[PDB]
Ligand binder design. Structure first.
Ligand SMILES: CN(C)C(=O)/C(C#N)=C\c1ccc(-c2nc3cnc4[nH]ccc4c3n2C2CCCCC2)o1
Ligand SMILES: NC(=O)Nc1ccccc1
Length: 290
């Protein structure tokens, strides 16, 4: 059931694109009559050995995960020729949380944002128990399964920690979403479950601003960077963070949630709460808001 025949996968449209891959909406149509189930299918482009190797990793991680808060693996496909590997996932037609928040802001209250926050945290706790660092976590890669249920997706940068080490180091990335990453990741290329906690803090900021473009992390950076304009953003960001500057509390954000953000953004990775510690707090806040 987990091998999809490539000649039965029918392309419909593009769901996502990165440097080295794309996720495409397809129909799996073994009967050839356009009645089959729809699926989301990842494949690589511009890929070298490192990219192919990372994709094999991504498939093994996603296949092993079984959480209500992680996008479901369905299977794999291989065509003829080479570079033929495809990853088949469930398709969630409500799309990403970033877009959903922007579209429906006026009817999504703080209780609903608290629900999403709790669900994302549960998915991250699941990941943590499997020693998996997600790295990419952001509203643009969390999917909406229904209006009261979200799931973590985009495992393109996910990695398992070795059994005896609590972090990994990479060679410097070419293109990082700098406003989501922990300072030790930006400066020293160190990633861990604690860098993921930093990014989750930025996710909370995204949720409680409804991903409004006027107060996006980049927009806030550009306001806070000061009157000197032509300074490289990464260099300046790292200075601001080292000075202790942080994203502001969204006006509508509950004070307790802002305090959690600040804890997620502790300078030392060891001072940040674990997802296991954040979950009960968000759960308490969500259940208090019903
Ligand atoms: C241009 N733009 C507005 C965006 O790209 C964006 C934002 N912000 C996010 C976005 C748009 C569409 C999707 C999307 N739908 C999906 C539906 N079922 C799916 N199953 C597995 C991945 C998946 C889906 N993805 C993404 C595909 C790439 C990885 C992240 C999820 O996410
Ligand atoms: N985590 C956090 O506060 N990051 C940040 C700070 C200033 C501007 C943009 C992003």
């Amino acid at each position: 059931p987990t091998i999809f025949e490539e000649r039965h996968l029918k392309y419909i449209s593009q769901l996502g694109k990165g440097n080295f891959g794309s996720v495409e909406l397809c129909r799996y149509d073994p009967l050839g009559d356009n009645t089959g189930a729809l699926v989301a299918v990842k494949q690589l482009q511009h890929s070298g050995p490192d990219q192919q190797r990372d994709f094999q990793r991504e498939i093994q991680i996603l296949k092993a995960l079984h959480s209500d808060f992680i996008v479901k693996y369905r299977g794999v496909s291989y065509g003829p020729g080479r570079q033929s590997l495809r990853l088949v996932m469930e398709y969630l037609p409500s799309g990403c949380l970033r877009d959903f928040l922007q579209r429906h802001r006026a009817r999504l209250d703080a209780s609903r944002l608290l629900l999403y926050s709790s669900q994302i945290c549960k998915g991250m706790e699941y990941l943590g128990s499997r020693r998996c660092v997600h790295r990419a976590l952001a509203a643009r890669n969390i999917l909406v399964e229904s209006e009261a249920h979200v799931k973590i997706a985009d495992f393109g940068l996910a990695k398992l920690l070795p059994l005896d080490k609590d972090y990994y180091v990479v060679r410097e990335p070419g293109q990082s979403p700098i406003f989501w990453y922990a300072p030790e990741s930006l400066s020293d290329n160190i990633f861990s479950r604690q860098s993921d906690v930093w990014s989750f803090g930025v996710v909370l900021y995204e949720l409680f601003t409804y991903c409004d473009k006027s107060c996006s992390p980049s927009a806030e950076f550009l306001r806070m960077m000061g009157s000197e304009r032509d300074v490289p953003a990464l260099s300046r960001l790292l200075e601001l963070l080292e000075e202790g500057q942080r994203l502001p509390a969204p006006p509508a954000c509950p004070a307790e949630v802002h305090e959690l953000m600040k804890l997620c953004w502790a300078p030392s990775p060891q001072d940040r709460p674990s997802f296991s510690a954040l979950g009960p707090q968000l759960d308490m806040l969500w259940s208090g808001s019903r």
